[PDB]
C-alpha cells in the first residue's frame, strides 16, 4: 500500500493520475502536509524540494524535475540556448531571439536591433513577435520602435515571426503541434505517440491576432469559424498524416516528426546534468509539453516548452494511463503508447 | 605557534572528541600514555602539533581540550577509557542531572549553576597559551546541554576572548538516531543566540553519516562509534592544516577569510571521499580524479543537499595522500565541463587546494579501510539552507500548537525567545534566497 | 585556468587555482538575562507553593 | 546514581507493588534475601536506579509501603519478596479508608500522611541525585486514591523540582467492589492532573477483557490481572533499569511524551499476551504491541490520534528489522500519527528479555483516545451524582457538594482538552 499526496487542485492530468491511482486499490491518498508520502503531485509554484528525500524508510517520488524552469521559462530558455554548447548561438531549430528587458528595470537591447537594421536594409522580411511567460498579452509588429515601446509599457523575449508557415488546405490557416513528453527517474525520454494539432480556423493574411496566434482560448472567444473544419480546432496525428500523404506526398514521421524527437532529446540532454536525480535523495519525473511550428518547407521549430502542461480530451485517459505505467508504476511497482527516445546519460 | 583549544559540550561533543583525540594521536605518532618518541624537544617546542598539545617535564604531550557535560556518565568513560592517561581531571567538567533535552535547561537553570566553573577551566589552559588563536567547540544541536549550554559558553568566550575566533562543529539532528522529539526547538534556539558569536560552523548531519555507514561501509544499523570515527576523518581533515606544516588554512582566521565572506552565512559544506569498507580485502584505489568528482555527489556531502541549485561563495580543496597539483588541476577542468558549478557575481570561481602528502590515518581494527588518497571539499554553498528549511518547518509545526513549550517557560525562558529566534532563522533563509537564488 | 601561490614543504603543498575572474552584548548584559530567567522560576515556584498552601 | 523512590499505597498499590519488585529483582538477579546471583553486568549497571547498597553486598528495594489497614501488607511481608523490602519502610494504620476517597484525603490518612513523608525524606536523603518518584495505587478505593493523592501533593510540596510518575488503576464495573468508585476516581484524576508529570493509566476494564477474551480466562482473578501489570510495568521501566540512549531517565521521557502539561495519561501495551513455546516474530511484536487488544487503557487508538509514542523492545533481535516495522506502522497508519509533532514515534531497544520469553515489545501511547476512559468514569460519576447518591459517606467525613461539582467540571475540562488536539 503506497502513500501520496496532492498538492495541485488544478492539474488536471494529475487529478485523472490521482483517480487511476486510488483506483488501483494500492495507492492511498494522505493530506497535503503530511509527510510520510511514497509520491507528491506537488504544486506549480515554489515546491519544497529540500524538504524530500529526509523521511527514512520511504523513498520518495516528486511529479517535478527541479531545475526544469530553465526550459520552460520564455527568457530562460533564449538564454539556455544562446550560452549552452550544446545547442550553440547558431541552433537551427530556434527562432533567433532575444531577451528584451523593460527599461523601467543581461539585456539584448543593441544586439536585437543590430540585426533588425541588417533585415530593413537586406530587404528581408523583418516582422518579429513580443511575448513573455507573464501573457494570458502579445504583440506582432514590423517595426521596432513598437515592440520595444511595447515592452515598456515584466522581462520579455522577441524572436523571429515565421512568416512562411506551413497552412493546411481547405482553409489556408496556420498550426501548432503540441508533443507530450515524459522523463522518468532514470531520465528516459518518452515521447507520446500521440500529439495535437491546435489549428486556427481562419485564414492566414500576411497583411487582428485571430488569423495568427493558435491558443485554444484565442481560437474559441475570438474566431467565428471555431469547430468548422476539425472538432474544437483540434486535428489530431491520425487526420494531418492522412493530410501530408495526400497534398504533400509524405508521412508526419518522415517530414515533421523526425524534427520533433531531436528537439526534444537536444533540450533534454542539455540539462540532464542539472536536474537529474540519478544519485540524489529522491527521485522526480516530469511530463512536458514541447509546441513546435512548422513551416512551408517542413523545418520544424521550437516556440515554447510547457511544464504544466494540460491534456486533450480525448488522450486525458490514455497518456495519465501510461505516467502511471512507466513513471510511477516503475518505482512503485503493483500487484507501448510511447516512444522511447535513446540517448547517452 | 599559536595554540587552538577544543571544548566539547554534552554527551555528541565529547565522544566525537574523544574519537578526533584518538585520530590525532594515531597521526601524530603519541601514545595513549602522552609520550611522543619522535618529539626530540622534550618538554616544550613550538611545532604545528604543539598547537593542540602541550607538553610536561616528563614528556607527556596533553591536548588542548576541555571536556563538559551535565551528566557525568559519558566523561566517565573518558576518565577510564584507553587514553585516561592523556587529560588531567581539571579538563574533564561533570555535573549530576543533565538538561534533559532542553535547551532552557541547559542555558539559563543548570548553566549559570556551571558556567564560571567551565571558563575558570578553559582559563588554565588559555594562561599555557603564548599567542591563542581561538576555540574549537564540538556539540550537538538537538541535546539539552550541547545547545542549551553551549550558546551560553559561546556568549561568555566572546567576552572574556573578544579577540579569538570560534568555530563550531555541530551535529545536526536526524530521526533515526534522534533521542527527542523537541531537537527542532534547541537546534534553532541554539542557532539564533550563538548565529553573531561563532566565525566558522561546520555543520553535520548525523542522516548523512548514517547513510555513508550503511551505503560505503556496509554497516546494517550504525552506532555512535560507527558515526564518530567517520567524523573524526572529516574533523582530522579540517583541522590537519593546524596540526601539520603547510600554507592554507593555517589559523582559524583563515577559515573565515577563505569560506566565510559574510559573516552570517558560515556554515560551509563539507564533503569527503574515499569511503570505503575495511571488510573488502582488496578495493581498486580511486585516482585524484574520481575522488574529486565524489566531492560533488550529494550522496558523499556531510548534509544532503543539491548544491546544483545554489551558488558558490568559495571552495576549499583539503586532500591527504599521494597527490600531486597536475592530477588536481586535470580533474577540476573535466569537472568544470560537467557539472553545474555556479558561484556568486561577486566572487572569483576557483578553489583553494591544500596537500598533505601523509595519507589519511585509520583506526586499527575499525570500519574505514586505509587508502593511498583522499579528499575533504569545504564549499560555502547557498543549498546547505535546505537544512535550514527543514528544521524551521519542523519547528513551524510544533510551535503552531505550543506543543512542549511548558517545558521551556518553566525553566524560566520567556515564549517570545521562541518567536525571536524563529525570526532570525526566517531571515538566515531570506539572506541565503537573496545569494543564490536570482 | 591559473595556478598562484604555490607553496611547497616537505609534508605537502598548497596553491590556488582560479577558473573564472569575479563579475556583541556585555557581561553586564548576559548576568541581567540569566538573572532574569531565574527570577521568574522563582515566581513560578512561589505560586505553586502558594496554590499548594491553599 | 540517579535514583528513584518507589511507593505503593492501598491494597491494590501493594499487591501490584509486590509483584513489581518480584519481576524486576528477577530480572537484576536478586533473590528475596536481596542478594545478587546474576549473570551479566548489564543487571547490575542501573541497578541503583531501584534498589539501595546495604551492607555483605545486599540490595534492597527503594520501597516505601503505605496502607491504612495491615492486612495487605501483612500479606506482602509474608509473600515471596516480603523479607527483601525495608522493614522501617512499612508504614501502615488501623483504622482503613473504607473504599472512600474523603477518609483517605482528609481524615483518616491526614493523621498517617506526616509520618509517611518521614521515611520518603530518609530515602531522598541519601539519594545522590534524585529522579523522583513512582506512586502504584487504584483510584477506585480509599487508601491508595485518597491517600495517595494526597502524599502525591505534599510531596510536590517538599520535593517540587522531581518527577511524579504513576502507575494508576482504572475503576471498571466488570472489576468492582463498591459503587463509589466512579466517585474515588473522579476526584483522585483531578489530582494527578495537577500534581503527576506521567500517569500510566492501567484499566481493569482492559485487563479483565485481555484474561477472558485473548488469554481464555472464564474467571479472571485479581491475581491474573496483576500478572499482565507485572508485565506492563516491567516493561515500561526498562529504559530505566538498563542501560540506553532514549527516554533514560523520568525528565527525558515527560519532555519525549508530553506535549501539554495536563496531557500525561499514557496508554500502556505488552506484547506478546499468549494464552506458548512458539517463537514471536519482529513483525508480529509491531503489530500487537499497536493492536488494541493488547492495550491497557480499553480505549480505541482508532478513534483518536497518537500525539507521542514510546516503543521497547526486548530481547536479542534484529534491530534493522525492528526500525523496519517501526517505520511500516507509522507509514502505513500515518492518520492516527498527529502531522504537527514530527517524528513523534520513539523506539528503545534492550539485550535482556523478561523472564520466560525471547522476545517481548512494549507500548506507551500518549493518545487522545484515553478521552474514552476519562468519559467513562464521567458518565458513572453524573448517572449517581445527579441524585446524590452514597454522598452521605463524604459528606459525613468534611466534604461538600461543591467539590464533587468542581472534580466534576474539570475532568470534563480534561475531555475537552482531549477532544481539542484529536481535530488538530
Ligand atoms: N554523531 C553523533 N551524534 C550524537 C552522539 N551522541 C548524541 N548524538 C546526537 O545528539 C542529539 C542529542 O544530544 P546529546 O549530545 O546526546 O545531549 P546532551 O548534549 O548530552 O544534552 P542533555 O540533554 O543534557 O543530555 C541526538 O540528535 C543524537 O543523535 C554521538 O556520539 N555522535
Ligand atoms: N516565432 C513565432 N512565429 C510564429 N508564430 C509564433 C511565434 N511565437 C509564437 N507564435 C504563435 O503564438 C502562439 C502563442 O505563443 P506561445 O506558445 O508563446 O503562447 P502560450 O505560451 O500562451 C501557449 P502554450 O502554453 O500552449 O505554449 C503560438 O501558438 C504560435 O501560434
Ligand atoms: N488490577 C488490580 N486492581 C485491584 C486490585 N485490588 C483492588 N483493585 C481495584 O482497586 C479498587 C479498590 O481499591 P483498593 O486498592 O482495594 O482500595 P484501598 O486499599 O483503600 O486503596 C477497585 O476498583 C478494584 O477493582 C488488584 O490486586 N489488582
Ligand atoms: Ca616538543
Ligand atoms: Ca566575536
Ligand atoms: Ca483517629
Ligand atoms: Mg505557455
Ligand atoms: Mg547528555
Ligand atoms: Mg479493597
Known amino acids: 500500500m503506497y502513500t501520496f499526496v496532492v498538492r495541485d487542485e488544478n492539474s488536471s492530468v494529475y487529478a485523472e493520475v490521482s483517480r487511476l491511482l486510488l483506483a488501483t486499490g494500492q495507492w492511498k491518498r494522505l493530506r497535503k502536509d503530511n509527510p510520510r508520502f511514497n509520491l507528491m503531485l506537488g504544486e506549480r509554484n515554489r515546491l519544497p524540494f529540500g524538504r524530500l528525500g529526509h523521511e527514512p524508510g520511504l523513498v520518495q517520488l516528486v511529479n517535478y524535475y527541479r531545475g526544469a524552469d530553465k526550459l520552460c521559462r520564455k527568457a530562460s530558455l533564449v538564454k539556455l540556448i544562446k550560452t549552452s554548447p550544446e545547442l550553440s548561438e547558431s541552433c537551427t531549430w530556434f527562432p533567433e531571439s532575444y531577451v528584451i528587458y523593460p527599461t523601467n528595470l543581461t539585456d539584448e537591447r543593441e544586439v536585437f536591433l543590430a540585426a533588425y537594421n541588417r533585415r530593413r536594409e537586406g530587404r528581408e522580411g523583418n516582422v518579429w513577435i513580443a511575448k513573455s511567460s507573464a501573457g494570458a498579452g502579445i504583440l506582432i509588429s514590423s517595426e521596432a520602435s513598437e515592440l520595444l515601446d511595447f515592452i515598456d509599457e515584466q522581462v520579455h523575449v522577441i524572436q523571429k515571426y515565421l512568416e512562411k508557415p506551413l497552412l493546411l488546405e481547405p482553409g489556408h490557416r496556420k498550426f501548432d503541434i503540441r508533443s507530450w513528453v515524459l522523463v522518468d ?63 504533400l506526398n509524405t508521412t508526419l514521421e518522415n517530414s515533421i516528426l523526425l524534427q520533433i524527437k531531436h528537439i526534444i532529446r537536444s533540450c533534454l540532454m542539455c540539462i540532464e546534468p542539472a536536474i537529474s536525480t540519478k544519485h540524489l535523495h529522491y527521485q522526480s519525473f516530469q511530463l512536458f509539453g514541447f509546441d513546435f511550428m512548422v513551416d512551408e518547407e517542413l523545418k520544424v521549430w521550437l516556440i515554447e ?41 | 605557534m599559536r595554540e587552538c583549544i577544543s571544548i566539547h559540550v554534552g554527551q555528541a561533543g565529547v565522544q566525537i572528541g ?65 587514553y585516561r592517561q592523556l587529560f588531567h581531571p581539571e579538563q574533564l567538567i561533570t555535573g549530576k542531572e543533565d538538561a534533559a533535552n532542553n535547551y532552557a535547561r541547559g542555558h539559563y537553570t543548570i548553566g549559570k549553576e556551571i558556567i564560571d566553573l567551565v571558563l575558570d577551566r578553559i582559563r588554565k589552559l588559555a594562561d599555557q597559551c603564548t599567542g591563542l588563536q581561538g576555540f574549537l567547540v564540538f556539540h550537538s544541536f538537538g541535546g539539552g546541554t550541547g ?43 541554539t542557532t539564533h543566540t550563538t548565529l553573531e558569536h561563532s566565525d566558522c560552523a561546520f555543520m553535520v548531519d548525523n542522516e548523512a553519516i548514517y547513510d555513508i555507514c550503511r551505503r560505503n561501509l556496509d554497516i546494517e544499523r550504525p552506532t555512535y562509534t560507527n558515526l564518530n570515527r567517520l567524523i573524526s576523518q572529516i574533523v582530522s581533515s579540517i583541522t590537519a592544516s593546524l596540526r601539520f606544516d603547510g600554507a592554507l588554512n593555517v589559523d582559524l582566521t583563515e577559515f573565515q577569510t577563505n569560506l566565510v565572506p559574510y559573516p552570517r552565512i558560515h556554515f560551509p559544506l563539507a564533503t569527503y571521499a574515499p569511503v570505503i569498507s575495511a571488510e573488502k580485502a582488496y578495493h581498486e584505489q580511486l585516482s585524484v580524479a574520481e575522488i574529486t568528482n565524489a566531492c560533488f555527489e550529494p550522496a558523499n556531502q556531510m548534509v544532503k543537499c543539491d548544491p546544483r541549485h545554489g551558488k558558490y561563495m568559495a571552495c576549499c580543496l583539503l586532500y591527504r595522500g599521494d597527490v600531486v597539483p597536475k592530477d588536481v588541476n586535470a580533474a577540476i577542468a573535466t569537472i568544470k565541463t560537467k557539472r553545474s558549478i555556479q558561484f556568486v557575481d561577486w566572487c572569483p570561481t576557483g578553489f583553494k587546494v591544500g596537500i598533505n602528502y601523509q595519507p589519511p590515518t585509520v583506526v586499527p581494527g575499525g570500519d574505514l579501510a586505509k587508502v593511498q588518497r583522499a579528499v575533504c571539499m569545504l564549499s560555502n554553498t547557498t543549498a546547505i539552507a535546505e537544512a535550514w528549511a527543514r528544521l524551521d518547518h519542523k519547528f513551524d509545526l510544533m510551535y503552531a500548537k505550543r506543543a512542549f513549550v511548558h517545558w521551556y517557560v518553566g525553566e524560566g525562558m520567556e515564549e517570545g525567545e521562541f518567536s525571536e529566534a524563529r525570526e532570525d532563522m526566517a531571515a538566515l533563509e531570506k539572506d541565503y534566497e537573496e545569494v543564490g537564488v536570482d | 585556468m591559473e595556478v598562484i601561490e604555490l607553496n611547497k614543504c616537505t609534508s605537502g603543498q598548497s596553491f590556488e587555482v582560479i577558473l573564472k575572474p569575479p563579475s556583541d552584548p556585555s557581561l553586564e548584559e548576559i548576568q541581567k538575562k540569566l538573572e532574569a530567567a531565574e527570577e521568574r522560576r522563582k515566581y513560578q515556584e512561589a505560586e505553586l507553593l502558594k496554590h499548594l498552601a491553599e | 546514581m540517579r535514583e528513584i523512590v518507589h511507593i505503593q499505597a492501598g491494597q491494590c498499590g501493594n499487591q501490584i507493588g509486590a509483584k513489581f519488585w518480584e519481576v524486576i529483582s528477577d530480572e537484576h538477579g536478586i533473590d528475596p534475601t536481596g542478594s545478587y546471583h546474576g549473570d551479566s553486568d548489564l543487571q547490575l549497571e542501573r541497578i541503583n536506579v531501584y534498589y539501595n547498597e546495604a551492607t555483605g553486598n545486599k540490595y534492597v528495594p527503594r520501597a516505601i509501603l503505605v496502607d491504612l489497614e495491615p492486612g495487605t501488607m501483612d500479606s506482602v511481608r509474608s509473600g515471596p519478596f516480603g523479607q527483601i523490602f525495608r522493614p522501617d519502610n512499612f508504614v501502615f494504620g488501623q483504622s482503613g479508608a473504607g473504599n472512600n476517597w474523603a477518609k483517605g484525603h482528609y481524615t483518616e490518612g491526614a493523621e498517617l500522611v506526616d509520618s509517611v513523608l518521614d521515611v520518603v525524606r530518609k530515602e531522598s536523603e541519601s539519594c545522590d541525585c534524585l529522579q523522583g518518584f513512582q506512586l502504584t495505587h487504584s483510584l477506585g478505593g480509599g487508601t491508595g486514591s485518597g491517600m495517595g493523592t494526597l502524599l502525591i501533593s505534599k510531596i510536590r510540596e517538599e520535593y517540587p523540582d522531581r518527577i511524579m510518575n504513576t502507575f494508576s488503576v482504572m475503576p471498571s464495573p466488570k472489576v468492582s467492589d463498591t459503587v463509589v468508585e466512579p466517585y474515588n476516581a473522579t476526584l483522585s484524576v483531578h489530582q494527578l492532573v495537577e500534581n503527576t508529570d506521567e500517569t500510566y493509566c492501567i484499566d481493569n476494564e482492559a485487563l479483565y477483557d485481555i484474561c477472558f477474551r485473548t488469554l481464555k480466562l472464564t474467571t479472571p482473578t485479581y491475581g491474573d490481572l496483576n500478572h499482565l501489570v507485572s508485565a506492563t510495568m516491567s516493561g515500561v521501566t526498562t529504559c530505566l533499569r538498563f542501560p540506553g540512549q532514549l527516554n533514560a531517565d523520568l525528565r527525558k521521557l515527560a519532555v519525549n511524551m508530553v506535549p501539554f502539561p495536563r496531557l500525561h495519561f499514557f496508554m500502556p501495551g505488552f506484547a506478546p499476551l499468549t494464552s506458548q513455546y512458539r517463537a514471536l516474530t519482529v513483525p508480529e511484536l509491531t503489530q500487537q504491541m499497536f493492536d488494541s487488544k493488547n492495550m491497557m487503557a480499553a480505549c480505541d487508538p482508532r478513534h483518536g490520534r497518537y500525539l507521542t509514542v514510546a516503543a521497547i523492545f526486548r530481547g536479542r533481535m534484529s534491530m534493522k528489522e525492528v526500525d523496519e516495522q517501526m517505520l511500516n506502522v507509522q507509514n502505513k497508519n500515518s492518520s492516527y500519527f498527529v502531522e504537527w509533532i514530527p517524528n513523534n514515534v520513539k523506539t528503545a531497544v534492550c539485550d535482556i528479555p523478561p523472564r520466560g520469553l525471547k522476545m517481548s515489545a512494549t507500548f506507551i501511547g500518549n493518545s487522545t483516545a484515553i478521552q474514552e476512559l476519562f468519559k467513562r468514569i464521567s458518565e458513572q460519576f453524573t448517572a449517581m451524582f445527579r441524585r446524590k447518591a452514597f454522598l452521605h459517606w463524604y459528606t459525613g467525613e468534611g466534604m461538600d457538594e461543591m467539590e464533587f461539582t468542581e472534580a466534576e467540571s474539570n475532568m470534563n475540562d480534561l475531555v475537552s482538552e482531549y477532544q481539542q488536539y484529536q481535530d488538530a
Open chain 1, 185 to 247: 527517474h532514470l531520465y528516459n525520454i518518452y515521447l507520446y505517440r500521440e500529439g495535437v494539432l491546435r489549428t486556427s480556423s481562419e485564414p492566414y493574411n500576411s497583411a487582428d491576432k485571430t488569423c495568427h496566434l493558435t491558443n485554444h482560448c484565442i481560437q474559441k472567444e475570438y474566431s467565428k469559424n471555431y469547430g468548422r473544419y476539425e472538432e474544437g480546432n483540434e486535428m489530431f496525428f491520425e487526420e494531418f498524416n492522412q493530410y501530408l500523404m495526400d497534398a
Open chain 1, 305 to 345: 516548452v510547457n511544464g504544466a502542461p494540460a491534456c486533450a480530451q480525448k488522450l486525458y485517459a490514455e497518456l495519465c494511463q501510461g505516467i502511471v505505467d512507466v513513471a510511477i508504476s516503475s518505482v512503485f511497482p503493483l500487484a507501448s503508447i510511447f516512444i522511447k527516445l535513446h540517448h547517452h546519460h
Open chain 2, 18 to 82: 574523544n574519537a578526533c583525540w584518538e585520530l590525532y594521536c594515531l597521526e601524530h605518532g603519541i601514545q595513549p600514555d602522552g609520550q611522543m618518541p619522535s618529539d626530540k624537544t622534550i618538554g616544550g617546542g613550538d611545532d604545528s602539533f604543539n598547537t593542540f598539545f602541550s607538553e610536561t617535564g616528563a614528556g607527556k604531550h596533553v591536548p588542548r581540550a576541555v571536556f563538559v557535560d551535565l551528566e557525568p556518565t559519558v566523561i566517565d568513560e573518558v576518565r577510564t577509557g584507553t
Open chain 2, 147 to 189: 545547545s542549551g549550554f553551549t550558546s551560553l559558553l559561546m556568549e561568555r568566550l566572546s567576552v572574556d576572548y573578544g579577540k579569538k575566533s570560534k568555530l563550531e562543529f555541530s551535529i545536526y539532528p536526524a530521526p533515526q538516531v534522534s533521542t527527542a522529539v523537541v531537537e527542532p526547538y534547541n537546534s534553532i534556539l
